[PDB]
Amino acid sequence: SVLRPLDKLPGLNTATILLVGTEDALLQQLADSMLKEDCASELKVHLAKSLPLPSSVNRPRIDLIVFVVNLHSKYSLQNTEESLRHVDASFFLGKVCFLATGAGRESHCSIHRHTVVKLAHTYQSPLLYCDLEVEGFRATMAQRLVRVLQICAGHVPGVSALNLLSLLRSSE
Amino acid sequence: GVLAHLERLETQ
Amino acid sequence: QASESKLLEIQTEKNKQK
Amino acid sequence: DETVAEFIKRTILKIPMNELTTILKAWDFLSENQLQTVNFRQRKESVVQHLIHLCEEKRASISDAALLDIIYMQFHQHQKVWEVFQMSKDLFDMKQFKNSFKKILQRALKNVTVSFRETEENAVWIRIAWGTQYTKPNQYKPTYVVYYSQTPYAFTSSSMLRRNTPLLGQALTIASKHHQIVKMDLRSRYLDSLKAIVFKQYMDSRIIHENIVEKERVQRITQETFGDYPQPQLEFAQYKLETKFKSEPLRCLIKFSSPHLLEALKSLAPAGIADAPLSPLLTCIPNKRMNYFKIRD
Amino acid sequence: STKESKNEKLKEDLEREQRWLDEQQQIMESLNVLHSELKNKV
Amino acid sequence: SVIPVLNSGSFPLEQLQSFPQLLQNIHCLELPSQMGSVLNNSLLLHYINCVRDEPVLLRFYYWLSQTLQEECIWYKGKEFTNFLDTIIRAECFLQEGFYSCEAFLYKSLPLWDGLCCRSQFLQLVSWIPFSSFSEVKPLLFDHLAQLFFTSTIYFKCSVLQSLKELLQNW
Amino acid sequence: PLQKRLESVRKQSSFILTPPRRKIPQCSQLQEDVDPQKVAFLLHKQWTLYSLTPLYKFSYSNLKEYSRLLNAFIVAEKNIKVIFSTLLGMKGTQRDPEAFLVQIVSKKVLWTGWFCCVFGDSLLETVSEDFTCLPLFLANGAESNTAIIGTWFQKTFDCYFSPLAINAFNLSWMAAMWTACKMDHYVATTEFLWSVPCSPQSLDISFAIHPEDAKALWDSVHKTPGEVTQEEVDLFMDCLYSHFHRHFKIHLSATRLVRVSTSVASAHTDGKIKILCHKYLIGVLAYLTELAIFQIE
């Protein structure tokens, strides 16, 4: 089931986020950091291990896609590229983002960061580096994700997803 | 100075 | 800049008599 | 004798001074007044010298020293690796069993230092110090064998038993009035876990988790395979495999090392590292009572 | 509050700048007089 | 120790305890075995300002770069903040930026969360050597924009102050 | 001067270029200047890795002065002596400086230090004439002695040792590199070690392959003769992972590789190196020499 950003209608001032990865505990902690504070708009969090997403007739709009990647394991990579085949190209227009964890510890980074940099640059998608283990870094990434959600969801008048993509674009 | 002031502003 | 030039010239001449 | 004196000294040095008193309460070879004459707050050299004085005042022998070593082994029971022997093919008596075992081991070559110590749950502990035809048995390379009355299993610490393994096995099976004796390939250090295994004696509704059916299935399968009870403390595993590639058979050899096995394996499926149903080669460790494995297609 | 904080920050930086300027001054006269003395000696 | 202990007709370095002594013996100074003590000793900084010596440049570069790497890896804090403050104070002098700090910031900016030592990081970008606006943007200003478009408004004012200071310095 | 072009070259150093292919080392006998006894002492020993900034004003002549200075520092810290030796034949090129050994002998060698650089020219291309570039340090002995020697070197030559680390990517690459090497005498089966990431100590998988099976699988996944390519390494790892999952349905790919051992040499992530065969020894150094540069730059 290929996911589409333009399937249904969203709720009244409602925003949704999707997190796809392997480490369930890290996803739960990241969602806890997400919902530590709530803005004016209500927020829904979805966590999944792989794509295509399980079928559900009651699925609301998923306005943001975030893939967590650990440089500690190639298994998370293979998961990401296998899951990437179950989403349309329209999500790639600023509705998709990549968050790499553990990049600071160069000794613990199994795969080289050049690989994920090339992967992100190939699809022209934003790339973010953070460490979920550290509480401060996790919190900072928490307001970062909340506010990028606010930008992409259309809550603030003036910009869209393609605008922020042209903002967050890398030179090469 | 003013940079320490801004940092103590994000502390809030 | 003036001090750098002065130190350069004094060092060069000092090595010059040596 | 000086040999027994230095043996007792070495055993005491092995014993932590914090529990030496308990050792005496378990040893009981020396009178309680002699124990009172020695304070344990003073220096280690002083206390060991006083213990040497006390044992020299009485008659120091090999049996009492061996009993002290046995009880030290009981209190520790963590410094040796244990293997399990099975006997197969109904009247028992302690005295005649001891007599027969002693006679067989004396008939082994000429002599051996054998000591017995009955323990709770019918745990007869036997300390054996081996000696050749022309030398007194050595007390620096001992072995321990644990026997349970009217049971088809026995435990052995194999530190130097590889020198003469069949002798101990035949002696044990003839003393146990059992015909067939075999060694299963099961080796571990936590002796109590071996005891258990051989006898089988062991919220923020805004978040909308997806694939929750997978999580609830994997946790249920893991719980059904492992169980709520604390799994036996097993520390080493090793599989020797030789199977066709199917992707001339490839010969593989894996060793699992863990301070607490059966728990990291229990957490693999919740962590998502392995599939929800683990392979039978890992789910039957307490079931099959097997530690070393060889499987072929 | 940022405006005050930067005001005193700039005042402190300016004072440090005059301190450094003063020190490098006598540094310059010392270097020049040493250079002249060495030139005259040779 | 973050700053190595100093170990020594050239004027001995230990005898350098007064400003007139430096004024008299500037010509016959000798380079220290380790120049880390040059940071907290302004006396040797005066000679460093004009020495323009190639080997000491590489020696201080490797020194400060490996020091920054070890401090950063050991952090994951107050001593690190104080050391970076001393580095910034020294950077205020010499009226020119260092390269070890530049390389460290280049390496750590993509990994930077934006809040570890924000006060320390944002004052180093002020002292960045002049370069064409075609190599720094792909490596430096991209992550700067990444933080800027998503971080706090006060952080935006912060980076604005940093860039205006950079413009002034350039 | 050198600083400007050095800035430019590390500005050009970005993680954008493809990883270049590496030439497989060939069977190379020890060089004539190489003393077999010295390397035999060096080989079959454990070494700890350290990366070093180029030496400042290092001379190979005044070795006795260095030895007496280290002895004075040691006695200041406190029947031992410090010996400096010069070792020939283990430089990758003529540009690479001469290598030397430092030994601590108790008047029985207890601590050994090796300074070397093989095929390391990028550092030598960006250095002035005064400095000596031997960024590779191998330590073998007590950690206290290593710390003391490091303190002396920091005080003397204005440099540090940094504990060099090896990630899973580099370790897998080097594993493929030595499994590409041809060994006449397969005297050690290849063996890999893993570690599941968990705060409590958990299972550590060790996976061993018979040398014949490993060589056959390698030649099956060997495409470019005499060269190793990233696709070869990736398919090697993928085949191993597929075999492991076919065996046990466990995704080994979600685990951290921590140690890789083969017939010729063995490496550990913390910085442990064991060398057995001299025929590829020199090439080994060259590879790890690049890592020192990659830590310096």
Place this chain on the structure above:
DNA sequence: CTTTCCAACGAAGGCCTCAAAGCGGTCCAAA
């Protein structure tokens, strides 16, 4: 056909480190 040694390497005793706690000195609360 027999005997002894090198090898394969396994293993456990011993060296070496440090994390633990009791004893000792010193400062500060109380008489």
Place this chain on the structure above:
DNA sequence: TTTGGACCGCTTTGAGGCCTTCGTTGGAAACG
């Protein structure tokens, strides 16, 4: 000002890592 109490200091020391030695079948090589 004097005395007791609690702090931090110091030494003692218990446990784990680790190198090396002992033991060694099993094969190879010499042979009454």
